């Protein structure tokens, strides 16, 4: 994984000192320094003419170097391209696939990727629309017992649980070509507006625990498949979600973290990860809040 503790890992009290010394304005200025980082990588596949319409946004390409490639394609429309990047996590390579909100013409590509990448958990942090702006397609069967066929992948909705800030859908993916079935847990977090932060850092961290528990529960019933994490572009809330997850993973296990290093490295894998200085400052603030709440400081 690129997410090694070194070289300036910080303990949770050094983090308190750090945030206290920089303040919100300093953390905002730190975010801008990450954006300045020389964008290593290229975006050619994203901009190939056969692929333009497979991007939801003109200004959110994805990196050639880390993109998820589609293997078992069918149809001249299905290239090997999907706007989705492998992302390392704490002590794990390809912990996540950060992807955009699937478009109608990429629903089939999305499920192909989920299938091929052995994905067990999907985290969605977007509503379908926001401000009447379309933000993500309805790429899964929404009602219990309904099914959609995406070529040789039939997805069936096995049940939905509605909770506080998220709904948990259990999907069966049926590869009807290889007669293989796999359960996939789809999580949709509903209280995270685009370009913004969640209303409760505590709800996001509890949701993160729910997702980790689900990923852990699914992996024990099968090296570890990535978690698909998408928002609308799959960079703003996605990068924030994933950075927070890595930082809490390193904090839990090593007693250290480094937000800067985490987001800097994440943006070499899912380009443009973390979209606003507000979301950047939220990683710091949620971690400190988790740490107070836990009596670590």
């Amino acid at each position: 994984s690129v997410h090694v503790p070194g070289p300036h890992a910080m303990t949770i009290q050094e983090l308190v000192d750090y945030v206290n010394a920089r303040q919100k304005q300093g953390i905002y200025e730190e975010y801008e320094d990450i954006r300045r980082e020389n964008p290593v990588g290229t975006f050619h596949c994203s901009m190939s003419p056969g692929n333009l319409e497979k991007n939801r946004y003109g200004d959110v390409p994805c990196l050639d170097q880390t993109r998820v490639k589609l293997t078992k394609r069918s149809g001249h429309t299905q290239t090997d391209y999907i706007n989705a990047s492998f992302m390392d996590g704490y002590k794990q390579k390809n912990a996540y696939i950060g992807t955009q909100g699937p478009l109608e013409n990429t629903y089939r590509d999305f499920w192909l990727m989920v299938w091929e990448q052995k994905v067990l958990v999907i985290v969605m942090t977007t509503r379908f629309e926001e401000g009447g702006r379309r933000k993500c397609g309805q790429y899964w069967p929404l009602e219990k017992d309904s099914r959609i066929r995406f070529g040789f992948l039939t997805v069936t909705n096995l049940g939905v649980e509605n909770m506080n800030h998220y709904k948990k859908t259990t999907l069966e993916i049926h590869n009807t070509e290889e007669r293989q079935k796999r359960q996939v847990t789809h999580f949709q977090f509903l209280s995270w507006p685009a370009y913004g932060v969640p209303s409760s850092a505590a709800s996001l961290i509890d949701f993160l625990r729910v997702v980790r528990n689900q990923q852990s529960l699914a992996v024990s019933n099968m090296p570890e498949p990535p978690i698909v994490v998408h928002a609308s572009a799959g960079i703003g809330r996605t990068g924030t979600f994933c950075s927070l997850d890595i930082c809490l993973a390193q904090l839990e296990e090593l007693g250290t973290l480094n937000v800067f290093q985490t987001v800097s490295r994440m943006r070499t894998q899912r380009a443009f990860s973390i979209q606003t200085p507000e979301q950047y400052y939220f990683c710091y603030k949620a971690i400190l809040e988790f740490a107070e709440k836990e009596g670590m400081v």
């Binding site: 939801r56 946004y57 003109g58 609308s232 703003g236 979209q275």
Partner: peptide, 7 residues
């Protein structure tokens, strides 16, 4: 077209 940034 559709832009993500600049709101």
């Amino acid at each position: 077209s559709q832009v993500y940034s600049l709101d």
